Design a protein around this ligand. Structure first.
Ligand SMILES: Clc1ccc(CNc2n[nH]c(-c3ccco3)n2)cc1
Ligand SMILES: Clc1ccc(CNc2n[nH]c(-c3ccco3)n2)cc1
Lengths: 170, 168
Protein backbone atom coordinates (compact mmCIF):
# COMPACT_ATOMS: atom_id res chain seq x y z
CA UNK A 1 0.00 0.00 0.00
CA UNK A 2 3.03 2.23 0.55
CA UNK A 3 4.52 1.98 -2.93
CA UNK A 4 2.47 3.69 -5.67
CA UNK A 5 4.44 2.80 -8.76
CA UNK A 6 6.15 -0.29 -10.10
CA UNK A 7 8.88 -0.75 -12.65
CA UNK A 8 9.12 -3.66 -15.06
CA UNK A 9 11.73 -5.18 -12.74
CA UNK A 10 9.25 -5.10 -9.90
CA UNK A 11 6.68 -6.79 -12.09
CA UNK A 12 9.18 -9.47 -13.11
CA UNK A 13 9.99 -9.97 -9.43
CA UNK A 14 6.28 -10.27 -8.82
CA UNK A 15 6.07 -12.91 -11.58
CA UNK A 16 8.66 -14.98 -9.67
CA UNK A 17 6.66 -14.84 -6.44
CA UNK A 18 9.25 -12.53 -4.92
CA UNK A 19 7.20 -9.32 -4.54
CA UNK A 20 4.22 -10.56 -2.53
CA UNK A 21 5.84 -13.77 -1.25
CA UNK A 22 5.30 -17.51 -1.78
CA UNK A 23 1.65 -18.62 -2.05
CA UNK A 24 0.52 -15.11 -2.94
CA UNK A 25 -0.33 -13.30 -6.12
CA UNK A 26 2.01 -13.68 -9.13
CA UNK A 27 1.71 -11.85 -12.39
CA UNK A 28 2.41 -13.92 -15.50
CA UNK A 29 5.95 -13.94 -16.77
CA UNK A 30 6.61 -13.13 -20.46
CA UNK A 31 5.17 -13.86 -22.82
CA UNK A 32 1.80 -13.62 -21.06
CA UNK A 33 2.76 -10.51 -19.07
CA UNK A 34 0.87 -7.61 -20.68
CA UNK A 35 2.16 -4.74 -18.55
CA UNK A 36 5.60 -3.06 -18.59
CA UNK A 37 5.01 -0.67 -15.73
CA UNK A 38 2.47 0.52 -13.20
CA UNK A 39 2.58 4.32 -13.24
CA UNK A 40 0.06 4.81 -10.48
CA UNK A 41 -1.67 2.55 -8.00
CA UNK A 42 -3.63 3.76 -5.00
CA UNK A 43 -6.51 2.59 -2.81
CA UNK A 44 -8.13 6.03 -2.66
CA UNK A 45 -9.37 8.17 -5.57
CA UNK A 46 -10.43 6.73 -8.89
CA UNK A 47 -13.84 6.93 -10.50
CA UNK A 48 -15.48 5.31 -7.44
CA UNK A 49 -13.30 6.62 -4.66
CA UNK A 50 -12.10 3.07 -4.00
CA UNK A 51 -8.76 3.13 -5.80
CA UNK A 52 -7.19 3.29 -9.24
CA UNK A 53 -4.44 1.80 -11.36
CA UNK A 54 -2.75 3.33 -14.35
CA UNK A 55 -0.32 1.10 -16.26
CA UNK A 56 1.54 1.00 -19.58
CA UNK A 57 2.64 -1.47 -22.21
CA UNK A 58 5.20 -0.30 -24.75
CA UNK A 59 4.50 -1.39 -28.31
CA UNK A 60 6.98 -2.21 -31.04
CA UNK A 61 6.58 -4.31 -34.19
CA UNK A 62 8.62 -7.29 -32.86
CA UNK A 63 6.27 -8.15 -30.02
CA UNK A 64 5.62 -11.89 -30.58
CA UNK A 65 1.89 -11.74 -31.10
CA UNK A 66 2.06 -9.44 -34.14
CA UNK A 67 3.60 -12.02 -36.52
CA UNK A 68 1.01 -14.77 -35.87
CA UNK A 69 -2.07 -12.52 -35.35
CA UNK A 70 -2.76 -12.15 -38.21
CA UNK A 71 -0.38 -12.98 -41.03
CA UNK A 72 -0.47 -9.95 -43.36
CA UNK A 73 -2.69 -8.04 -40.90
CA UNK A 74 -0.84 -7.56 -37.63
CA UNK A 75 -2.91 -6.45 -34.63
CA UNK A 76 -2.63 -6.96 -30.85
CA UNK A 77 -5.11 -9.58 -29.77
CA UNK A 78 -8.02 -7.99 -27.94
CA UNK A 79 -7.98 -10.85 -25.45
CA UNK A 80 -4.49 -9.86 -24.26
CA UNK A 81 -5.43 -6.24 -23.60
CA UNK A 82 -8.43 -7.51 -21.74
CA UNK A 83 -6.13 -9.81 -19.82
CA UNK A 84 -3.87 -6.90 -18.84
CA UNK A 85 -6.87 -5.44 -17.03
CA UNK A 86 -7.39 -8.74 -15.14
CA UNK A 87 -3.63 -8.75 -14.40
CA UNK A 88 -3.88 -5.29 -12.84
CA UNK A 89 -6.93 -6.14 -10.77
CA UNK A 90 -5.24 -9.29 -9.36
CA UNK A 91 -2.09 -7.34 -8.64
CA UNK A 92 -4.18 -4.78 -6.78
CA UNK A 93 -5.49 -7.47 -4.44
CA UNK A 94 -1.94 -8.70 -3.74
CA UNK A 95 -0.72 -5.17 -3.24
CA UNK A 96 -3.36 -4.65 -0.56
CA UNK A 97 -1.70 -7.48 1.40
CA UNK A 98 -4.21 -10.25 0.84
CA UNK A 99 -2.92 -13.82 0.65
CA UNK A 100 -3.48 -16.47 -2.01
CA UNK A 101 -3.04 -17.05 -5.74
CA UNK A 102 -4.95 -15.18 -8.43
CA UNK A 103 -7.74 -16.41 -10.67
CA UNK A 104 -9.85 -14.17 -12.92
CA UNK A 105 -13.58 -14.82 -12.42
CA UNK A 106 -14.86 -12.93 -15.48
CA UNK A 107 -16.41 -9.60 -16.49
CA UNK A 108 -19.62 -7.86 -17.41
CA UNK A 109 -19.75 -6.09 -20.74
CA UNK A 110 -16.53 -5.93 -22.79
CA UNK A 111 -16.31 -3.69 -25.84
CA UNK A 112 -13.61 -3.44 -28.44
CA UNK A 113 -14.02 -0.30 -30.62
CA UNK A 114 -10.42 0.19 -31.82
CA UNK A 115 -7.09 -1.64 -32.20
CA UNK A 116 -3.39 -1.70 -31.52
CA UNK A 117 -1.16 -1.77 -34.61
CA UNK A 118 2.59 -2.56 -34.61
CA UNK A 119 3.21 1.15 -35.42
CA UNK A 120 1.67 2.28 -32.09
CA UNK A 121 3.94 3.53 -29.31
CA UNK A 122 2.19 2.81 -26.07
CA UNK A 123 -0.89 1.19 -24.61
CA UNK A 124 -2.25 2.58 -21.33
CA UNK A 125 -4.63 0.80 -18.99
CA UNK A 126 -6.88 2.74 -16.63
CA UNK A 127 -8.57 0.65 -13.94
CA UNK A 128 -11.12 1.93 -11.47
CA UNK A 129 -11.76 -0.23 -8.48
CA UNK A 130 -15.43 -0.44 -7.67
CA UNK A 131 -15.46 -2.81 -4.71
CA UNK A 132 -13.33 -5.24 -2.78
CA UNK A 133 -14.79 -8.08 -0.73
CA UNK A 134 -12.67 -9.57 2.06
CA UNK A 135 -15.49 -11.63 3.51
CA UNK A 136 -14.22 -15.19 3.13
CA UNK A 137 -13.21 -15.37 -0.51
CA UNK A 138 -11.26 -12.29 -1.43
CA UNK A 139 -12.19 -10.60 -4.66
CA UNK A 140 -12.22 -7.31 -6.48
CA UNK A 141 -14.58 -5.75 -8.99
CA UNK A 142 -13.56 -2.99 -11.33
CA UNK A 143 -14.12 -1.07 -14.52
CA UNK A 144 -11.34 -0.66 -17.05
CA UNK A 145 -10.33 1.04 -20.26
CA UNK A 146 -7.58 0.37 -22.73
CA UNK A 147 -6.13 3.25 -24.70
CA UNK A 148 -3.49 3.48 -27.40
CA UNK A 149 -1.48 6.68 -27.94
CA UNK A 150 -4.22 8.74 -26.29
CA UNK A 151 -7.19 7.04 -27.92
CA UNK A 152 -9.62 4.92 -25.89
CA UNK A 153 -10.23 1.62 -27.74
CA UNK A 154 -11.63 -0.98 -25.25
CA UNK A 155 -13.88 -0.91 -22.21
CA UNK A 156 -14.76 -3.53 -19.63
CA UNK A 157 -17.31 -3.30 -16.86
CA UNK A 158 -17.41 -5.60 -13.86
CA UNK A 159 -13.97 -7.15 -14.18
CA UNK A 160 -13.68 -9.65 -11.37
CA UNK A 161 -10.59 -11.34 -9.93
CA UNK A 162 -10.29 -13.50 -6.86
CA UNK A 163 -7.46 -14.76 -4.64
CA UNK A 164 -7.33 -18.31 -3.44
CA UNK A 165 -5.30 -19.82 -0.66
CA UNK A 166 -6.25 -23.10 -2.23
CA UNK A 167 -7.31 -23.09 -5.95
CA UNK A 168 -8.30 -26.80 -5.54
CA UNK A 169 -12.00 -26.03 -6.29
CA UNK A 170 -11.13 -24.95 -9.93
CA UNK B 1 -21.16 -23.78 -45.79
CA UNK B 2 -20.59 -27.06 -47.58
CA UNK B 3 -17.91 -28.49 -45.25
CA UNK B 4 -18.84 -29.34 -41.64
CA UNK B 5 -15.53 -30.26 -40.09
CA UNK B 6 -11.96 -28.93 -40.27
CA UNK B 7 -8.61 -30.46 -39.41
CA UNK B 8 -5.67 -28.63 -37.89
CA UNK B 9 -4.09 -28.37 -41.35
CA UNK B 10 -7.27 -26.69 -42.62
CA UNK B 11 -7.03 -24.23 -39.77
CA UNK B 12 -3.39 -23.53 -40.50
CA UNK B 13 -4.36 -22.97 -44.15
CA UNK B 14 -7.03 -20.58 -42.91
CA UNK B 15 -4.36 -18.77 -40.86
CA UNK B 16 -2.36 -18.17 -44.04
CA UNK B 17 -5.37 -16.64 -45.82
CA UNK B 18 -5.63 -19.71 -48.02
CA UNK B 19 -8.98 -21.14 -46.90
CA UNK B 20 -11.34 -18.21 -47.38
CA UNK B 21 -9.10 -16.25 -49.73
CA UNK B 22 -7.27 -12.93 -49.63
CA UNK B 23 -8.98 -10.03 -47.82
CA UNK B 24 -11.17 -12.50 -45.87
CA UNK B 25 -11.17 -14.05 -42.44
CA UNK B 26 -7.94 -15.51 -41.00
CA UNK B 27 -7.50 -17.40 -37.83
CA UNK B 28 -4.38 -16.62 -35.87
CA UNK B 29 -1.35 -18.77 -36.48
CA UNK B 30 0.47 -20.36 -33.56
CA UNK B 31 1.03 -19.41 -30.93
CA UNK B 32 -2.22 -17.40 -30.75
CA UNK B 33 -4.24 -20.16 -32.43
CA UNK B 34 -6.34 -21.76 -29.66
CA UNK B 35 -8.07 -24.48 -31.71
CA UNK B 36 -6.69 -27.75 -33.11
CA UNK B 37 -9.81 -28.88 -34.92
CA UNK B 38 -13.40 -28.06 -35.63
CA UNK B 39 -15.39 -31.23 -35.06
CA UNK B 40 -18.74 -29.76 -36.16
CA UNK B 41 -19.88 -26.53 -37.74
CA UNK B 42 -23.37 -25.92 -39.14
CA UNK B 43 -25.74 -23.02 -39.75
CA UNK B 44 -28.78 -24.89 -38.56
CA UNK B 45 -29.39 -26.39 -35.12
CA UNK B 46 -27.68 -25.17 -32.00
CA UNK B 47 -29.32 -23.71 -28.90
CA UNK B 48 -31.01 -20.98 -30.94
CA UNK B 49 -31.61 -22.79 -34.21
CA UNK B 50 -29.15 -20.48 -35.97
CA UNK B 51 -26.08 -22.71 -36.04
CA UNK B 52 -23.41 -24.28 -33.86
CA UNK B 53 -19.69 -24.96 -33.61
CA UNK B 54 -17.91 -27.65 -31.65
CA UNK B 55 -14.13 -27.48 -31.57
CA UNK B 56 -11.21 -28.96 -29.64
CA UNK B 57 -7.80 -28.01 -28.32
CA UNK B 58 -5.45 -30.83 -27.21
CA UNK B 59 -3.60 -30.19 -23.95
CA UNK B 60 -0.19 -31.39 -22.85
CA UNK B 61 2.24 -30.06 -20.22
CA UNK B 62 4.63 -28.53 -22.77
CA UNK B 63 2.23 -26.01 -24.25
CA UNK B 64 4.14 -22.70 -24.10
CA UNK B 65 1.76 -20.78 -21.89
CA UNK B 66 2.08 -23.21 -18.96
CA UNK B 67 5.67 -22.29 -18.11
CA UNK B 68 5.13 -18.54 -17.85
CA UNK B 69 1.55 -18.59 -16.48
CA UNK B 70 2.19 -18.90 -13.62
CA UNK B 71 5.66 -19.97 -12.47
CA UNK B 72 5.07 -22.76 -9.93
CA UNK B 73 1.33 -22.73 -10.68
CA UNK B 74 0.70 -23.67 -14.31
CA UNK B 75 -2.75 -22.94 -15.70
CA UNK B 76 -4.06 -22.04 -19.16
CA UNK B 77 -4.84 -18.34 -19.33
CA UNK B 78 -8.57 -17.71 -19.18
CA UNK B 79 -8.22 -14.99 -21.78
CA UNK B 80 -6.97 -17.53 -24.34
CA UNK B 81 -9.91 -19.87 -23.90
CA UNK B 82 -12.14 -16.87 -24.24
CA UNK B 83 -10.26 -15.94 -27.38
CA UNK B 84 -10.86 -19.38 -28.81
CA UNK B 85 -14.54 -18.60 -28.72
CA UNK B 86 -14.00 -15.33 -30.60
CA UNK B 87 -11.82 -17.29 -33.04
CA UNK B 88 -14.69 -19.70 -33.71
CA UNK B 89 -17.30 -16.97 -34.16
CA UNK B 90 -15.13 -15.13 -36.69
CA UNK B 91 -14.39 -18.33 -38.53
CA UNK B 92 -18.13 -18.94 -38.74
CA UNK B 93 -18.66 -15.64 -40.47
CA UNK B 94 -15.94 -16.43 -43.04
CA UNK B 95 -17.31 -19.92 -43.44
CA UNK B 96 -20.69 -18.45 -44.41
CA UNK B 97 -18.99 -16.73 -47.35
CA UNK B 98 -18.92 -13.18 -46.02
CA UNK B 99 -15.99 -11.02 -47.10
CA UNK B 100 -13.58 -9.02 -44.93
CA UNK B 101 -11.12 -9.39 -42.08
CA UNK B 102 -12.14 -10.35 -38.53
CA UNK B 103 -12.19 -8.20 -35.44
CA UNK B 104 -13.78 -9.16 -32.15
CA UNK B 105 -16.17 -6.49 -30.88
CA UNK B 106 -16.61 -7.78 -27.32
CA UNK B 107 -18.97 -9.84 -25.16
CA UNK B 108 -21.65 -9.64 -22.49
CA UNK B 109 -21.07 -11.58 -19.28
CA UNK B 110 -17.98 -13.78 -19.14
CA UNK B 111 -17.48 -16.25 -16.23
CA UNK B 112 -14.57 -18.42 -15.30
CA UNK B 113 -15.51 -21.10 -12.78
CA UNK B 114 -12.82 -23.69 -13.47
CA UNK B 115 -9.38 -24.10 -15.06
CA UNK B 116 -7.22 -26.02 -17.48
CA UNK B 117 -4.19 -27.69 -15.88
CA UNK B 118 -1.21 -29.18 -17.74
CA UNK B 119 -2.52 -32.65 -16.82
CA UNK B 120 -5.76 -32.12 -18.76
CA UNK B 121 -6.25 -34.01 -22.05
CA UNK B 122 -8.58 -31.86 -24.10
CA UNK B 123 -10.47 -28.63 -24.16
CA UNK B 124 -13.76 -28.46 -26.02
CA UNK B 125 -15.57 -25.30 -27.14
CA UNK B 126 -19.30 -25.22 -27.78
CA UNK B 127 -20.60 -22.12 -29.56
CA UNK B 128 -24.20 -21.38 -30.21
CA UNK B 129 -24.91 -18.75 -32.82
CA UNK B 130 -27.68 -16.43 -31.73
CA UNK B 131 -27.83 -13.94 -34.60
CA UNK B 132 -26.02 -12.79 -37.71
CA UNK B 133 -26.46 -9.31 -39.12
CA UNK B 134 -25.62 -8.67 -42.77
CA UNK B 135 -21.58 -4.20 -41.45
CA UNK B 136 -21.45 -7.96 -41.01
CA UNK B 137 -21.38 -9.38 -37.49
CA UNK B 138 -22.31 -12.40 -35.42
CA UNK B 139 -23.54 -12.79 -31.87
CA UNK B 140 -23.15 -15.99 -29.97
CA UNK B 141 -23.08 -17.71 -26.65
CA UNK B 142 -20.18 -20.01 -25.79
CA UNK B 143 -18.88 -22.52 -23.24
CA UNK B 144 -15.42 -23.91 -22.61
CA UNK B 145 -15.07 -27.37 -21.14
CA UNK B 146 -12.13 -29.51 -20.12
CA UNK B 147 -12.35 -33.33 -20.20
CA UNK B 148 -16.16 -33.13 -19.98
CA UNK B 149 -16.37 -30.44 -17.33
CA UNK B 150 -17.77 -27.00 -18.13
CA UNK B 151 -15.45 -24.31 -16.81
CA UNK B 152 -16.14 -21.01 -18.70
CA UNK B 153 -19.19 -19.28 -20.13
CA UNK B 154 -19.60 -16.22 -22.34
CA UNK B 155 -22.89 -14.57 -23.41
CA UNK B 156 -23.14 -12.14 -26.32
CA UNK B 157 -19.78 -12.84 -27.94
CA UNK B 158 -19.61 -10.44 -30.88
CA UNK B 159 -17.29 -10.58 -33.89
CA UNK B 160 -17.40 -8.44 -37.02
CA UNK B 161 -15.90 -8.58 -40.48
CA UNK B 162 -14.36 -5.54 -42.05
CA UNK B 163 -13.55 -4.97 -45.69
CA UNK B 164 -11.34 -2.09 -44.46
CA UNK B 165 -9.64 -2.07 -40.94
CA UNK B 166 -7.79 1.23 -41.87
CA UNK B 167 -10.43 3.15 -39.89
CA UNK B 168 -10.67 0.77 -36.90
CL1 LIG C 1 -0.96 -10.80 -9.87
C1 LIG C 1 -2.32 -11.73 -10.77
C2 LIG C 1 -3.22 -11.00 -11.57
C3 LIG C 1 -4.25 -11.65 -12.24
C4 LIG C 1 -4.41 -13.03 -12.16
C5 LIG C 1 -5.48 -13.61 -12.84
N1 LIG C 1 -5.14 -14.16 -14.18
C6 LIG C 1 -5.77 -15.24 -14.69
N2 LIG C 1 -5.46 -15.79 -15.86
N3 LIG C 1 -6.18 -16.78 -16.04
C7 LIG C 1 -7.03 -16.90 -15.02
C8 LIG C 1 -7.93 -17.86 -14.91
C9 LIG C 1 -8.95 -17.85 -14.08
C10 LIG C 1 -9.59 -19.00 -14.20
C11 LIG C 1 -8.97 -19.76 -15.09
O1 LIG C 1 -7.86 -19.01 -15.53
N4 LIG C 1 -6.77 -15.95 -14.12
C12 LIG C 1 -3.52 -13.78 -11.36
C13 LIG C 1 -2.48 -13.12 -10.68
CL1 LIG D 1 -11.23 -16.39 -38.53
C1 LIG D 1 -11.17 -15.06 -37.34
C2 LIG D 1 -11.73 -15.27 -36.07
C3 LIG D 1 -11.72 -14.27 -35.10
C4 LIG D 1 -11.16 -13.05 -35.36
C5 LIG D 1 -11.19 -12.05 -34.40
N1 LIG D 1 -10.15 -12.14 -33.35
C6 LIG D 1 -9.69 -11.04 -32.81
N2 LIG D 1 -8.62 -10.98 -32.02
N3 LIG D 1 -8.45 -9.69 -31.71
C7 LIG D 1 -9.43 -8.99 -32.30
C8 LIG D 1 -9.57 -7.67 -32.13
C9 LIG D 1 -10.70 -6.98 -32.23
C10 LIG D 1 -10.48 -5.70 -31.97
C11 LIG D 1 -9.21 -5.50 -31.65
O1 LIG D 1 -8.55 -6.80 -31.73
N4 LIG D 1 -10.22 -9.82 -33.00
C12 LIG D 1 -10.61 -12.84 -36.64
C13 LIG D 1 -10.59 -13.84 -37.63
Amino acid sequence: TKQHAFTREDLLRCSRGELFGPGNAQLPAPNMLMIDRIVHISDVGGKYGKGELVAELDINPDLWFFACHFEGDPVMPGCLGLDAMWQLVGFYLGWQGNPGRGRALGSGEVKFFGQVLPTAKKVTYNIHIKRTINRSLVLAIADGTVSVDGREIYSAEGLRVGLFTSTDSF
